[PDB]
Amino acid sequence: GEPLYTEQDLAVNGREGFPNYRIPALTVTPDGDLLASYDGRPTGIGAPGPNSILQRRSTDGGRTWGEQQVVSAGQTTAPIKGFSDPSYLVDRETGTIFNFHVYSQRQGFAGSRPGTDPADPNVLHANVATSTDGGLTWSHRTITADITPDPGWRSRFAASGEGIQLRYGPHAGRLIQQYTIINAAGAFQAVSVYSDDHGRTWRAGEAVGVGMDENKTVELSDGRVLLNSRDSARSGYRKVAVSTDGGHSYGPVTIDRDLPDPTNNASIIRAFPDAPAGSARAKVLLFSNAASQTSRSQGTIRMSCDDGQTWPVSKVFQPGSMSYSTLTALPDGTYGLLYEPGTGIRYANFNLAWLGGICAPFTIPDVALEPGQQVTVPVAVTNQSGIAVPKPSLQLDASPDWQVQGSVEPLMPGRQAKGQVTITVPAGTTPGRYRVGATLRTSAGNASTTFTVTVGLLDQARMSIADVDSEETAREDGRASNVIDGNPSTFWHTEWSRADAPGYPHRISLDLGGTHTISGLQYTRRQNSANEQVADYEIYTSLNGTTWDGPVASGRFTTSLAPQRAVFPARDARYIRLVALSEQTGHKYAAVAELEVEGQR
Ligand SMILES: OC[C@H]1O[C@@H](O[C@H]2[C@H](O)[C@@H](O)[C@@H](O)O[C@@H]2CO)[C@H](O)[C@@H](O)[C@H]1O
Numbered sequence: 229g230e231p232l233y234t235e236q237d238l239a240v241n242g243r244e245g246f247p248n249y250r251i252p253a254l255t256v257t258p259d260g261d262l263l264a265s266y267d268g269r270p271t272g273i274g275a276p277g278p279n280s281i282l283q284r285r286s287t288d289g290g291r292t293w294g295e296q297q298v299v300s301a302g303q304t305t306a307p308i309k310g311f312s313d314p315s316y317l318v319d320r321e322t323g324t325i326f327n328f329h330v331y332s333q334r335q336g337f338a339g340s341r342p343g344t345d346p347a348d349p350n351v352l353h354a355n356v357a358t359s360t361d362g363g364l365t366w367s368h369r370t371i372t373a374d375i376t377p378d379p380g381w382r383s384r385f386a387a388s389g390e391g392i393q394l395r396y397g398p399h400a401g402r403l404i405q406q407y408t409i410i411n412a413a414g415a416f417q418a419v420s421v422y423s424d425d426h427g428r429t430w431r432a433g434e435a436v437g438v439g440m441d442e443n444k445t446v447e448l449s450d451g452r453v454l455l456n457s458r459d460s461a462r463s464g465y466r467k468v469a470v471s472t473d474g475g476h477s478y479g480p481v482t483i484d485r486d487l488p489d490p491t492n493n494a495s496i497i498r499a500f501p502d503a504p505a506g507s508a509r510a511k512v513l514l515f516s517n518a519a520s521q522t523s524r525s526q527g528t529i530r531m532s533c534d535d536g537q538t539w540p541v542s543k544v545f546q547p548g549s550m551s552y553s554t555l556t557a558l559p560d561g562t563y564g565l566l567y568e569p570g571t572g573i574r575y576a577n578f579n580l581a582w583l584g585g586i587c588a589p590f591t592i593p594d595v596a597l598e599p600g601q602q603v604t605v606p607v608a609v610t611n612q613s614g615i616a617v618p619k620p621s622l623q624l625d626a627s628p629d630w631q632v633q634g635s636v637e638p639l640m641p642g643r644q645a646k647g648q649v650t651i652t653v654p655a656g657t658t659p660g661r662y663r664v665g666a667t668l669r670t671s672a673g674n675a676s677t678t679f680t681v682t683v684g685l686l687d688q689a690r691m692s693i694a695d696v697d698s699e700e701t702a703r704e705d706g707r708a709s710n711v712i713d714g715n716p717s718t719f720w721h722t723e724w725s726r727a728d729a730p731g732y733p734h735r736i737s738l739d740l741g742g743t744h745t746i747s748g749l750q751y752t753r754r755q756n757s758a759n760e761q762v763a764d765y766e767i768y769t770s771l772n773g774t775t776w777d778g779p780v781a782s783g784r785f786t787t788s789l790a791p792q793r794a795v796f797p798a799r800d801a802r803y804i805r806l807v808a809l810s811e812q813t814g815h816k817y818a819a820v821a822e823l824e825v826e827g828q829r
């Protein structure tokens with residue numbers, strides 16, 4: 229059908245009563261009105277700012293919106309009160325609407341103290357507003373005491389956005405709202421808060437994870453509940469866990485490297501929430517976030533057709549600033565999206581024709597070659613769409629100087645299809661890891677993936693640490709081996725937690741695993757700290773690990789976050805040694821995220 233994407237601002241900072249608006253929640257009422265909620269922040273801050281929970285209503289499917297109304301009013305005269313960070317939850321069996329939010333007095337989330345007495349100003353309280361009239365009027369309650377089974381949980385907040393009601397299983401009808409808690413150790417954990425009596429009473433489940441933050445849940449085609457979290461430990465990705473007991477408890481937490489994230493809120497929903505258990509439609513999920521590891525920008529919608537196992541489909545909705553976002557399924561088959569563009573709160577509406585996808589996830593393996601060479605790699609399409617595609621094509625996005633081309637056999641319902649990509653890399657290509665994008669194009673929509681082509685770099689998996697002058701292991705993981713794991717977020721760090729640790733120079737040496745012809749080293753600085761950066765350096769090599777040749781290269785690195793090359797005339801070696809002679813501004817320690825060796829495998 230005709231693609232649809234429209235937006236309109238619902239709140240603009242400085243207009244209609246507040247200098248700052250933040251934190252979106254969106255839902256559709258049983259009668260079909262859309263409700264948008266967000267904080268008004270008179271002093272521009274989260275709790276314990278004297279904030280208010282606001283709401284706008286649309287009775288024409290989102291085309292026009294009503295006046296801004298107060299759900300919960302902050303108070304700037306004694307006694308001070310603030311209400312912040314809304315999450316909507318509709319009980320579709322009773323018609324009741326809930327809006328969860330914090331209730332602050334003296335403390336915000338980090339400063340909250342143990343206790344559950346509503347009158348204690350040093351607790352960050354868990355409140356909920358309830359409406360039995362479609363969100364026209366609200367009653368208010370504090371539920372902290374009901375959802376704090378462990379007295380060491382000193383703080384909590386409901387994750388902003390929208391919670392869910394289970395439709396499947398023995399706990400069908402359960403209302404689930406996610407929280408973050410701070411435990412006695414100071415760790416941030418996720419916990420589902422839920423009601424099996426239509427919101428009359430609430431309790432907490434079992435907490436999960438560490439390094440958690442705002443988190444969301446969604447009911448999968450088979451009833452399991454999938455948890456998708458912001459990572460307060462800042463991996464660059466979303467964290468995921470799954471429950472098979474209706475959100476009471478979850479399994480282990482993993483990093484989902486399909487879902488890059490800059491440590492920011494996000495949303496995940498059923499595309500077809502009324503679909504029956506086990507149906508194809510019941511497996512379809514939509515996800516919204518900032519698709520970036522570094523900045524809150526490049527707002528993207530993703531679609532999965534397999535309960536979140538793969539995300540074949542994606543499309544950018546906001547290339548610029550894009551912070552919190554929340555999705556909801558609309559009665560007309562389209563989707564609403566409430567998000568933060570930097571100026572307040574914006575409402576967008578889109579359909580699946582805009583998203584332009586086909587449910588056909590596909591894989592292409594990573595591959596390594598030398599400059600001057602050609603290689604062919606297999607492509608494997610899993611057609612989840614249920615339809616035949618007679619003329620699929622495969623478009624690749626690689627360096628303009630390379631020759632890359634691909635093809636794929638016709639797609640058949642319920643079948644895998646084969647294809648291939650051929651890559652030719654010209655002589656003289658700079659050694660490096662090159663990410664290549666691939667798009668499966670069809671008249672019924674497109675799917676995408678990426679793969680990495682490594683050109684003229686040795687295999688880190690065959691390498692080991694031959695020696696190192698100093699490494700921290702007591703207070704953090706700064707093992708030397710962290711330079712050869714392929715992961716820019718793990719680093720070697722020299723010893724720092726003892727006073728008598730050495731300063732510069734520092735030194736790390738690699739065993740390449742065998743003799744190779746090599747001609748360079750590439751250094752990557754530690755990504756999240758500035759004061760352990762290598763500056764002046766020398767490189768040496770060896771055939772035996774004891775007698776060193778060089779310096780074969782010398783120089784001074786910059787503060788660039790990207791790999792930096794140090795090159796030297798091609799030579800045979802089994803071992804390579806980096807001597808870090810100084811730090812950029814004279815500090816005592818060295819840290820290195822990654823070392824790669826330019827050479828022939
Ligand atoms: O002392 C070396 C370690 O410093 C840690 O950072 C310190 C920071 O320099 C100091 O200003 C402070 O307030 O606490 C920080 C601890 O998080 C680095 O994180 C660590 O890796 C070492 O470099």
Ligand code: NA
Pocket residue numbers: 710711712713714715716717718719821822
């Ligand atoms: Na690393």
